Amino acid sequence: RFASVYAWNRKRISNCVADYSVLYNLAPFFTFKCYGVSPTKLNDLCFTN
Amino acid sequence: KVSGNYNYLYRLFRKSNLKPFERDISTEIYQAGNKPCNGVAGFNCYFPL
C-alpha cells in the first residue's frame, strides 16, 4: 500500500549501492524520463543521499 | 520567439565520443537495450534529436 498524495511518505535510502537493472526490466512500467542525467547513467555516479 | 522557435535542435544520446572538428550528421535511431531496435523508436530505443 502507498500513502495518499496529500500525505505522501518519504523513504530514506543510504549506506548501500543501487542497482538499476531490475527497475528498467519491469514489465508494467510505461514512462521513465530523467532530466538532470541520462536514464542509462544511474550506475556511474555517487549519490550523497 | 513568443510562439515558440523550435528550428534549433541538439542531442541527448550518442553511441560513442567524437574526435575534435568531426564532420558528419548521422540522425539514425539510437537504442539502449541489448536487443536491436529498427524502424520506429520503441522500448530502450528513442529518437536522438
mmCIF file of N, CA, C and O in Angstrom:
data_model
loop_
_atom_site.group_PDB
_atom_site.id
_atom_site.type_symbol
_atom_site.label_atom_id
_atom_site.label_comp_id
_atom_site.label_asym_id
_atom_site.label_seq_id
_atom_site.Cartn_x
_atom_site.Cartn_y
_atom_site.Cartn_z
ATOM 1 N N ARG A 1 0.836 -1.189 0.000
ATOM 2 C CA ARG A 1 0.000 0.000 0.000
ATOM 3 C C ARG A 1 0.875 1.245 0.000
ATOM 4 O O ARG A 1 1.930 1.284 0.641
ATOM 5 N N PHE A 2 0.426 2.264 -0.726
ATOM 6 C CA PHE A 2 1.092 3.557 -0.779
ATOM 7 C C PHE A 2 0.288 4.575 0.014
ATOM 8 O O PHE A 2 -0.925 4.422 0.189
ATOM 9 N N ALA A 3 0.969 5.603 0.510
ATOM 10 C CA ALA A 3 0.283 6.691 1.186
ATOM 11 C C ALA A 3 -0.458 7.563 0.176
ATOM 12 O O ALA A 3 -0.179 7.546 -1.026
ATOM 13 N N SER A 4 -1.421 8.331 0.680
ATOM 14 C CA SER A 4 -2.179 9.222 -0.183
ATOM 15 C C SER A 4 -1.299 10.372 -0.664
ATOM 16 O O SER A 4 -0.226 10.642 -0.118
ATOM 17 N N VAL A 5 -1.768 11.052 -1.712
ATOM 18 C CA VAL A 5 -0.969 12.106 -2.335
ATOM 19 C C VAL A 5 -0.734 13.251 -1.359
ATOM 20 O O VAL A 5 0.391 13.743 -1.214
ATOM 21 N N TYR A 6 -1.790 13.694 -0.675
ATOM 22 C CA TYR A 6 -1.642 14.813 0.249
ATOM 23 C C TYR A 6 -0.858 14.430 1.498
ATOM 24 O O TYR A 6 -0.342 15.316 2.186
ATOM 25 N N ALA A 7 -0.741 13.137 1.793
ATOM 26 C CA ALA A 7 0.036 12.678 2.937
ATOM 27 C C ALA A 7 1.086 11.672 2.485
ATOM 28 O O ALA A 7 1.230 10.602 3.083
ATOM 29 N N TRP A 8 1.815 12.012 1.423
ATOM 30 C CA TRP A 8 2.788 11.094 0.849
ATOM 31 C C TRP A 8 3.916 10.806 1.833
ATOM 32 O O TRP A 8 4.325 11.665 2.618
ATOM 33 N N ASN A 9 4.412 9.576 1.784
ATOM 34 C CA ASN A 9 5.526 9.154 2.615
ATOM 35 C C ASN A 9 6.848 9.389 1.893
ATOM 36 O O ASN A 9 6.917 9.430 0.663
ATOM 37 N N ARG A 10 7.908 9.549 2.683
ATOM 38 C CA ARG A 10 9.257 9.721 2.159
ATOM 39 C C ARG A 10 10.155 8.663 2.778
ATOM 40 O O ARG A 10 10.301 8.608 4.003
ATOM 41 N N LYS A 11 10.755 7.829 1.934
ATOM 42 C CA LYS A 11 11.624 6.748 2.378
ATOM 43 C C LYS A 11 13.073 7.114 2.098
ATOM 44 O O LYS A 11 13.425 7.447 0.962
ATOM 45 N N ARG A 12 13.909 7.046 3.130
ATOM 46 C CA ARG A 12 15.306 7.447 3.040
ATOM 47 C C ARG A 12 16.181 6.222 2.810
ATOM 48 O O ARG A 12 16.054 5.219 3.521
ATOM 49 N N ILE A 13 17.066 6.307 1.818
ATOM 50 C CA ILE A 13 17.973 5.223 1.461
ATOM 51 C C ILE A 13 19.399 5.751 1.515
ATOM 52 O O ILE A 13 19.693 6.813 0.952
ATOM 53 N N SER A 14 20.278 5.015 2.188
ATOM 54 C CA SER A 14 21.680 5.399 2.289
ATOM 55 C C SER A 14 22.496 4.179 2.691
ATOM 56 O O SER A 14 21.953 3.139 3.072
ATOM 57 N N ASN A 15 23.819 4.326 2.594
ATOM 58 C CA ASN A 15 24.775 3.292 3.001
ATOM 59 C C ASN A 15 24.570 1.991 2.225
ATOM 60 O O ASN A 15 24.726 0.894 2.765
ATOM 61 N N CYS A 16 24.218 2.114 0.949
ATOM 62 C CA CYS A 16 24.149 0.966 0.057
ATOM 63 C C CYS A 16 24.349 1.460 -1.366
ATOM 64 O O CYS A 16 24.197 2.649 -1.653
ATOM 65 N N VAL A 17 24.695 0.534 -2.256
ATOM 66 C CA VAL A 17 24.887 0.837 -3.668
ATOM 67 C C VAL A 17 23.663 0.351 -4.431
ATOM 68 O O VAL A 17 23.167 -0.757 -4.188
ATOM 69 N N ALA A 18 23.161 1.186 -5.334
ATOM 70 C CA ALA A 18 21.914 0.924 -6.033
ATOM 71 C C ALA A 18 22.172 0.249 -7.372
ATOM 72 O O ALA A 18 23.069 0.650 -8.121
ATOM 73 N N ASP A 19 21.380 -0.779 -7.667
ATOM 74 C CA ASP A 19 21.434 -1.498 -8.933
ATOM 75 C C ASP A 19 20.157 -1.219 -9.716
ATOM 76 O O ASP A 19 19.053 -1.459 -9.215
ATOM 77 N N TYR A 20 20.312 -0.723 -10.944
ATOM 78 C CA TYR A 20 19.194 -0.282 -11.771
ATOM 79 C C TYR A 20 18.901 -1.199 -12.948
ATOM 80 O O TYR A 20 18.266 -0.764 -13.914
ATOM 81 N N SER A 21 19.354 -2.453 -12.899
ATOM 82 C CA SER A 21 18.955 -3.415 -13.921
ATOM 83 C C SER A 21 17.471 -3.743 -13.815
ATOM 84 O O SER A 21 16.758 -3.776 -14.823
ATOM 85 N N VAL A 22 16.991 -4.005 -12.595
ATOM 86 C CA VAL A 22 15.637 -4.528 -12.413
ATOM 87 C C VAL A 22 14.572 -3.453 -12.601
ATOM 88 O O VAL A 22 13.462 -3.752 -13.054
ATOM 89 N N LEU A 23 14.871 -2.200 -12.247
ATOM 90 C CA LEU A 23 13.890 -1.132 -12.415
ATOM 91 C C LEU A 23 13.539 -0.944 -13.885
ATOM 92 O O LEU A 23 12.368 -0.777 -14.242
ATOM 93 N N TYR A 24 14.543 -0.988 -14.759
ATOM 94 C CA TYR A 24 14.283 -0.842 -16.184
ATOM 95 C C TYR A 24 13.729 -2.109 -16.822
ATOM 96 O O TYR A 24 13.234 -2.043 -17.952
ATOM 97 N N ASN A 25 13.785 -3.247 -16.132
ATOM 98 C CA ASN A 25 13.309 -4.514 -16.668
ATOM 99 C C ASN A 25 11.902 -4.877 -16.208
ATOM 100 O O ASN A 25 11.434 -5.977 -16.517
ATOM 101 N N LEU A 26 11.219 -3.997 -15.479
ATOM 102 C CA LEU A 26 9.876 -4.304 -15.002
ATOM 103 C C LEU A 26 8.860 -4.086 -16.118
ATOM 104 O O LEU A 26 8.837 -3.026 -16.752
ATOM 105 N N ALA A 27 8.022 -5.096 -16.355
ATOM 106 C CA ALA A 27 7.102 -5.060 -17.492
ATOM 107 C C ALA A 27 6.090 -3.919 -17.442
ATOM 108 O O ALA A 27 5.979 -3.185 -18.440
ATOM 109 N N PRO A 28 5.340 -3.696 -16.360
ATOM 110 C CA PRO A 28 4.240 -2.726 -16.414
ATOM 111 C C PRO A 28 4.666 -1.268 -16.331
ATOM 112 O O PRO A 28 3.801 -0.405 -16.158
ATOM 113 N N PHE A 29 5.954 -0.961 -16.452
ATOM 114 C CA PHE A 29 6.398 0.426 -16.449
ATOM 115 C C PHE A 29 6.126 1.058 -17.806
ATOM 116 O O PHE A 29 6.534 0.528 -18.844
ATOM 117 N N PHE A 30 5.437 2.197 -17.796
ATOM 118 C CA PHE A 30 5.018 2.869 -19.019
ATOM 119 C C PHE A 30 5.939 4.019 -19.405
ATOM 120 O O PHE A 30 6.378 4.098 -20.555
ATOM 121 N N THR A 31 6.245 4.912 -18.466
ATOM 122 C CA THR A 31 7.080 6.070 -18.747
ATOM 123 C C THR A 31 8.208 6.167 -17.731
ATOM 124 O O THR A 31 8.036 5.833 -16.556
ATOM 125 N N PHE A 32 9.372 6.609 -18.206
ATOM 126 C CA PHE A 32 10.502 6.914 -17.333
ATOM 127 C C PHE A 32 11.438 7.840 -18.101
ATOM 128 O O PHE A 32 12.040 7.429 -19.097
ATOM 129 N N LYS A 33 11.531 9.090 -17.655
ATOM 130 C CA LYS A 33 12.354 10.100 -18.306
ATOM 131 C C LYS A 33 13.046 10.921 -17.230
ATOM 132 O O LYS A 33 12.387 11.447 -16.327
ATOM 133 N N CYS A 34 14.368 11.026 -17.322
ATOM 134 C CA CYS A 34 15.166 11.702 -16.312
ATOM 135 C C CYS A 34 15.842 12.919 -16.928
ATOM 136 O O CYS A 34 16.481 12.815 -17.980
ATOM 137 N N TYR A 35 15.699 14.066 -16.263
ATOM 138 C CA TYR A 35 16.107 15.354 -16.817
ATOM 139 C C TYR A 35 17.583 15.652 -16.559
ATOM 140 O O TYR A 35 18.345 15.905 -17.498
ATOM 141 N N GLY A 36 17.993 15.632 -15.289
ATOM 142 C CA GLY A 36 19.348 16.037 -14.951
ATOM 143 C C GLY A 36 20.404 15.144 -15.570
ATOM 144 O O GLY A 36 21.430 15.625 -16.057
ATOM 145 N N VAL A 37 20.168 13.834 -15.570
ATOM 146 C CA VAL A 37 21.117 12.869 -16.103
ATOM 147 C C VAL A 37 20.391 11.940 -17.064
ATOM 148 O O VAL A 37 19.163 11.832 -17.058
ATOM 149 N N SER A 38 21.176 11.270 -17.905
ATOM 150 C CA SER A 38 20.621 10.280 -18.811
ATOM 151 C C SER A 38 20.040 9.113 -18.013
ATOM 152 O O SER A 38 20.541 8.776 -16.936
ATOM 153 N N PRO A 39 18.969 8.489 -18.507
ATOM 154 C CA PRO A 39 18.400 7.340 -17.785
ATOM 155 C C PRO A 39 19.354 6.166 -17.662
ATOM 156 O O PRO A 39 19.171 5.332 -16.767
ATOM 157 N N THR A 40 20.365 6.075 -18.522
ATOM 158 C CA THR A 40 21.283 4.944 -18.525
ATOM 159 C C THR A 40 22.546 5.185 -17.707
ATOM 160 O O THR A 40 23.399 4.294 -17.642
ATOM 161 N N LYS A 41 22.690 6.351 -17.078
ATOM 162 C CA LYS A 41 23.883 6.682 -16.304
ATOM 163 C C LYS A 41 23.578 6.781 -14.810
ATOM 164 O O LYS A 41 24.101 7.647 -14.105
ATOM 165 N N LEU A 42 22.723 5.890 -14.310
ATOM 166 C CA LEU A 42 22.451 5.843 -12.879
ATOM 167 C C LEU A 42 23.465 4.999 -12.118
ATOM 168 O O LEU A 42 23.522 5.085 -10.887
ATOM 169 N N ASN A 43 24.270 4.198 -12.819
ATOM 170 C CA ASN A 43 25.231 3.297 -12.196
ATOM 171 C C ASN A 43 26.672 3.764 -12.363
ATOM 172 O O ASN A 43 27.602 2.985 -12.134
ATOM 173 N N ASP A 44 26.880 5.016 -12.759
ATOM 174 C CA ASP A 44 28.213 5.603 -12.841
ATOM 175 C C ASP A 44 28.240 6.952 -12.142
ATOM 176 O O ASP A 44 28.817 7.924 -12.637
ATOM 177 N N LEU A 45 27.604 7.027 -10.975
ATOM 178 C CA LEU A 45 27.543 8.258 -10.203
ATOM 179 C C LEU A 45 27.477 7.907 -8.725
ATOM 180 O O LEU A 45 27.117 6.789 -8.346
ATOM 181 N N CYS A 46 27.832 8.878 -7.892
ATOM 182 C CA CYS A 46 27.784 8.732 -6.444
ATOM 183 C C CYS A 46 26.697 9.640 -5.887
ATOM 184 O O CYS A 46 26.647 10.830 -6.213
ATOM 185 N N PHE A 47 25.830 9.074 -5.054
ATOM 186 C CA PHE A 47 24.666 9.773 -4.529
ATOM 187 C C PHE A 47 24.945 10.193 -3.093
ATOM 188 O O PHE A 47 25.253 9.349 -2.244
ATOM 189 N N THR A 48 24.839 11.497 -2.824
ATOM 190 C CA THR A 48 25.057 11.992 -1.470
ATOM 191 C C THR A 48 23.982 11.485 -0.517
ATOM 192 O O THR A 48 24.282 11.082 0.611
ATOM 193 N N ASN A 49 22.726 11.504 -0.956
ATOM 194 C CA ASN A 49 21.616 10.983 -0.174
ATOM 195 C C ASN A 49 20.501 10.594 -1.130
ATOM 196 O O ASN A 49 20.312 11.226 -2.173
ATOM 197 N N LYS B 1 11.362 33.283 -29.749
ATOM 198 C CA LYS B 1 10.047 33.568 -30.301
ATOM 199 C C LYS B 1 8.985 33.354 -29.232
ATOM 200 O O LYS B 1 9.056 32.397 -28.455
ATOM 201 N N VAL B 2 8.003 34.258 -29.196
ATOM 202 C CA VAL B 2 6.910 34.133 -28.236
ATOM 203 C C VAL B 2 6.107 32.867 -28.505
ATOM 204 O O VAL B 2 5.755 32.128 -27.579
ATOM 205 N N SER B 3 5.811 32.595 -29.776
ATOM 206 C CA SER B 3 5.059 31.406 -30.131
ATOM 207 C C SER B 3 5.845 30.116 -30.054
ATOM 208 O O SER B 3 5.239 29.040 -30.093
ATOM 209 N N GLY B 4 7.169 30.196 -29.944
ATOM 210 C CA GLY B 4 7.989 29.007 -29.825
ATOM 211 C C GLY B 4 8.832 28.719 -31.049
ATOM 212 O O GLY B 4 8.327 28.209 -32.055
ATOM 213 N N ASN B 5 10.121 29.042 -30.976
ATOM 214 C CA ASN B 5 11.063 28.741 -32.049
ATOM 215 C C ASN B 5 11.673 27.371 -31.780
ATOM 216 O O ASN B 5 12.398 27.189 -30.796
ATOM 217 N N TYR B 6 11.379 26.405 -32.652
ATOM 218 C CA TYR B 6 11.838 25.033 -32.472
ATOM 219 C C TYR B 6 12.680 24.544 -33.645
ATOM 220 O O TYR B 6 12.798 23.334 -33.856
ATOM 221 N N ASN B 7 13.270 25.457 -34.410
ATOM 222 C CA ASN B 7 14.141 25.096 -35.519
ATOM 223 C C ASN B 7 15.568 24.800 -35.075
ATOM 224 O O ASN B 7 16.394 24.411 -35.906
ATOM 225 N N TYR B 8 15.873 24.973 -33.791
ATOM 226 C CA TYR B 8 17.184 24.675 -33.234
ATOM 227 C C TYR B 8 17.089 23.401 -32.407
ATOM 228 O O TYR B 8 16.192 23.268 -31.570
ATOM 229 N N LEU B 9 18.014 22.471 -32.639
ATOM 230 C CA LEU B 9 17.959 21.161 -32.011
ATOM 231 C C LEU B 9 19.321 20.789 -31.438
ATOM 232 O O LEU B 9 20.347 21.386 -31.773
ATOM 233 N N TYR B 10 19.307 19.795 -30.558
ATOM 234 C CA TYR B 10 20.526 19.209 -30.010
ATOM 235 C C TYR B 10 20.296 17.706 -29.889
ATOM 236 O O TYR B 10 19.354 17.149 -30.464
ATOM 237 N N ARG B 11 21.158 17.030 -29.135
ATOM 238 C CA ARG B 11 21.071 15.588 -28.958
ATOM 239 C C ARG B 11 21.129 15.240 -27.478
ATOM 240 O O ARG B 11 21.661 15.993 -26.659
ATOM 241 N N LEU B 12 20.564 14.078 -27.143
ATOM 242 C CA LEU B 12 20.618 13.560 -25.784
ATOM 243 C C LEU B 12 21.426 12.279 -25.653
ATOM 244 O O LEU B 12 21.746 11.888 -24.527
ATOM 245 N N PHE B 13 21.751 11.614 -26.759
ATOM 246 C CA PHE B 13 22.493 10.365 -26.696
ATOM 247 C C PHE B 13 23.314 10.211 -27.969
ATOM 248 O O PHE B 13 22.891 10.626 -29.051
ATOM 249 N N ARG B 14 24.502 9.626 -27.822
ATOM 250 C CA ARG B 14 25.315 9.216 -28.956
ATOM 251 C C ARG B 14 26.028 7.921 -28.597
ATOM 252 O O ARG B 14 26.318 7.660 -27.427
ATOM 253 N N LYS B 15 26.304 7.111 -29.621
ATOM 254 C CA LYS B 15 26.907 5.803 -29.389
ATOM 255 C C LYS B 15 28.322 5.924 -28.836
ATOM 256 O O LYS B 15 28.717 5.149 -27.959
ATOM 257 N N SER B 16 29.097 6.887 -29.330
ATOM 258 C CA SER B 16 30.499 6.992 -28.958
ATOM 259 C C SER B 16 30.909 8.457 -28.918
ATOM 260 O O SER B 16 30.207 9.338 -29.421
ATOM 261 N N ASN B 17 32.062 8.705 -28.303
ATOM 262 C CA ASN B 17 32.643 10.035 -28.245
ATOM 263 C C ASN B 17 33.225 10.381 -29.617
ATOM 264 O O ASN B 17 33.488 9.508 -30.448
ATOM 265 N N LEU B 18 33.433 11.673 -29.862
ATOM 266 C CA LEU B 18 33.875 12.159 -31.160
ATOM 267 C C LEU B 18 35.223 12.856 -31.043
ATOM 268 O O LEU B 18 35.548 13.455 -30.015
ATOM 269 N N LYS B 19 36.010 12.761 -32.116
ATOM 270 C CA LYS B 19 37.260 13.489 -32.237
ATOM 271 C C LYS B 19 36.980 14.956 -32.564
ATOM 272 O O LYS B 19 35.923 15.284 -33.111
ATOM 273 N N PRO B 20 37.902 15.861 -32.230
ATOM 274 C CA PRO B 20 37.649 17.285 -32.476
ATOM 275 C C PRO B 20 37.497 17.583 -33.960
ATOM 276 O O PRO B 20 38.100 16.931 -34.814
ATOM 277 N N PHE B 21 36.665 18.584 -34.252
ATOM 278 C CA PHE B 21 36.381 19.011 -35.623
ATOM 279 C C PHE B 21 35.846 17.857 -36.466
ATOM 280 O O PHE B 21 36.159 17.731 -37.652
ATOM 281 N N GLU B 22 35.031 17.005 -35.850
ATOM 282 C CA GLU B 22 34.429 15.891 -36.563
ATOM 283 C C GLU B 22 33.336 16.390 -37.503
ATOM 284 O O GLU B 22 32.745 17.452 -37.292
ATOM 285 N N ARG B 23 33.073 15.606 -38.554
ATOM 286 C CA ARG B 23 32.258 16.050 -39.693
ATOM 287 C C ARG B 23 31.354 14.919 -40.195
ATOM 288 O O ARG B 23 31.733 14.158 -41.090
ATOM 289 N N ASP B 24 30.155 14.831 -39.609
ATOM 290 C CA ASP B 24 29.009 14.027 -40.049
ATOM 291 C C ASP B 24 27.830 14.239 -39.095
ATOM 292 O O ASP B 24 27.991 14.719 -37.965
ATOM 293 N N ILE B 25 26.635 13.872 -39.579
ATOM 294 C CA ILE B 25 25.365 14.379 -39.058
ATOM 295 C C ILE B 25 24.375 13.235 -38.842
ATOM 296 O O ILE B 25 23.166 13.461 -38.726
ATOM 297 N N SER B 26 24.881 12.003 -38.779
ATOM 298 C CA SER B 26 24.034 10.811 -38.761
ATOM 299 C C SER B 26 22.911 10.921 -37.737
ATOM 300 O O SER B 26 23.158 10.997 -36.530
ATOM 301 N N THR B 27 21.669 10.919 -38.227
ATOM 302 C CA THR B 27 20.480 11.016 -37.387
ATOM 303 C C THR B 27 19.769 9.674 -37.241
ATOM 304 O O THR B 27 18.542 9.624 -37.132
ATOM 305 N N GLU B 28 20.525 8.580 -37.242
ATOM 306 C CA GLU B 28 19.928 7.263 -37.099
ATOM 307 C C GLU B 28 19.377 7.076 -35.688
ATOM 308 O O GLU B 28 19.793 7.738 -34.734
ATOM 309 N N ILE B 29 18.415 6.158 -35.567
ATOM 310 C CA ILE B 29 17.803 5.879 -34.274
ATOM 311 C C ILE B 29 18.827 5.242 -33.345
ATOM 312 O O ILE B 29 19.610 4.371 -33.749
ATOM 313 N N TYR B 30 18.831 5.683 -32.090
ATOM 314 C CA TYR B 30 19.769 5.205 -31.085
ATOM 315 C C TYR B 30 19.024 4.361 -30.061
ATOM 316 O O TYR B 30 17.945 4.746 -29.601
ATOM 317 N N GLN B 31 19.599 3.215 -29.709
ATOM 318 C CA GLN B 31 18.987 2.290 -28.769
ATOM 319 C C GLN B 31 19.870 2.125 -27.541
ATOM 320 O O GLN B 31 21.090 2.311 -27.600
ATOM 321 N N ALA B 32 19.237 1.781 -26.422
ATOM 322 C CA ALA B 32 19.941 1.494 -25.180
ATOM 323 C C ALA B 32 19.867 0.034 -24.764
ATOM 324 O O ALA B 32 20.761 -0.439 -24.062
ATOM 325 N N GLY B 33 18.824 -0.686 -25.179
ATOM 326 C CA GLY B 33 18.691 -2.077 -24.808
ATOM 327 C C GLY B 33 19.590 -2.994 -25.616
ATOM 328 O O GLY B 33 20.111 -2.637 -26.672
ATOM 329 N N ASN B 34 19.769 -4.208 -25.090
ATOM 330 C CA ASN B 34 20.615 -5.190 -25.758
ATOM 331 C C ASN B 34 20.031 -5.606 -27.102
ATOM 332 O O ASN B 34 20.764 -5.746 -28.088
ATOM 333 N N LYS B 35 18.718 -5.814 -27.160
ATOM 334 C CA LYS B 35 18.087 -6.223 -28.405
ATOM 335 C C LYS B 35 18.157 -5.094 -29.433
ATOM 336 O O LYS B 35 18.048 -3.917 -29.074
ATOM 337 N N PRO B 36 18.366 -5.416 -30.709
ATOM 338 C CA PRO B 36 18.388 -4.369 -31.736
ATOM 339 C C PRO B 36 17.026 -3.708 -31.885
ATOM 340 O O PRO B 36 15.983 -4.351 -31.754
ATOM 341 N N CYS B 37 17.047 -2.407 -32.165
ATOM 342 C CA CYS B 37 15.837 -1.642 -32.437
ATOM 343 C C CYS B 37 15.939 -1.047 -33.832
ATOM 344 O O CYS B 37 16.928 -0.380 -34.155
ATOM 345 N N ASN B 38 14.920 -1.288 -34.651
ATOM 346 C CA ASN B 38 14.910 -0.846 -36.036
ATOM 347 C C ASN B 38 13.570 -0.201 -36.356
ATOM 348 O O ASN B 38 12.549 -0.491 -35.727
ATOM 349 N N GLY B 39 13.588 0.686 -37.347
ATOM 350 C CA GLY B 39 12.381 1.363 -37.774
ATOM 351 C C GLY B 39 12.008 2.528 -36.882
ATOM 352 O O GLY B 39 12.719 3.537 -36.836
ATOM 353 N N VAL B 40 10.897 2.401 -36.167
ATOM 354 C CA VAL B 40 10.435 3.454 -35.279
ATOM 355 C C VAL B 40 11.026 3.236 -33.892
ATOM 356 O O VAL B 40 11.406 2.124 -33.514
ATOM 357 N N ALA B 41 11.112 4.319 -33.126
ATOM 358 C CA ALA B 41 11.610 4.235 -31.762
ATOM 359 C C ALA B 41 10.619 3.490 -30.877
ATOM 360 O O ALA B 41 9.406 3.697 -30.963
ATOM 361 N N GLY B 42 11.145 2.618 -30.022
ATOM 362 C CA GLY B 42 10.307 1.849 -29.124
ATOM 363 C C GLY B 42 10.863 1.777 -27.718
ATOM 364 O O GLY B 42 11.341 2.781 -27.180
ATOM 365 N N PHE B 43 10.798 0.598 -27.106
ATOM 366 C CA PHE B 43 11.343 0.411 -25.769
ATOM 367 C C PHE B 43 12.861 0.309 -25.839
ATOM 368 O O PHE B 43 13.406 -0.414 -26.680
ATOM 369 N N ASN B 44 13.541 1.048 -24.957
ATOM 370 C CA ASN B 44 15.003 1.071 -24.890
ATOM 371 C C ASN B 44 15.625 1.551 -26.199
ATOM 372 O O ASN B 44 16.763 1.206 -26.524
ATOM 373 N N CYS B 45 14.875 2.352 -26.956
ATOM 374 C CA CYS B 45 15.366 2.918 -28.211
ATOM 375 C C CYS B 45 14.490 4.117 -28.547
ATOM 376 O O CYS B 45 13.283 3.963 -28.754
ATOM 377 N N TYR B 46 15.087 5.305 -28.587
ATOM 378 C CA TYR B 46 14.322 6.535 -28.705
ATOM 379 C C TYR B 46 14.985 7.479 -29.699
ATOM 380 O O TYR B 46 16.143 7.305 -30.090
ATOM 381 N N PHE B 47 14.222 8.483 -30.109
ATOM 382 C CA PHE B 47 14.676 9.409 -31.138
ATOM 383 C C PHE B 47 15.746 10.330 -30.563
ATOM 384 O O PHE B 47 15.506 10.997 -29.550
ATOM 385 N N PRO B 48 16.933 10.396 -31.173
ATOM 386 C CA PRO B 48 18.074 11.059 -30.528
ATOM 387 C C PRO B 48 18.116 12.571 -30.680
ATOM 388 O O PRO B 48 19.030 13.197 -30.132
ATOM 389 N N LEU B 49 17.178 13.184 -31.394
ATOM 390 C CA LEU B 49 17.195 14.622 -31.628
ATOM 391 C C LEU B 49 16.077 15.284 -30.834
ATOM 392 O O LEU B 49 14.926 14.838 -30.885
#
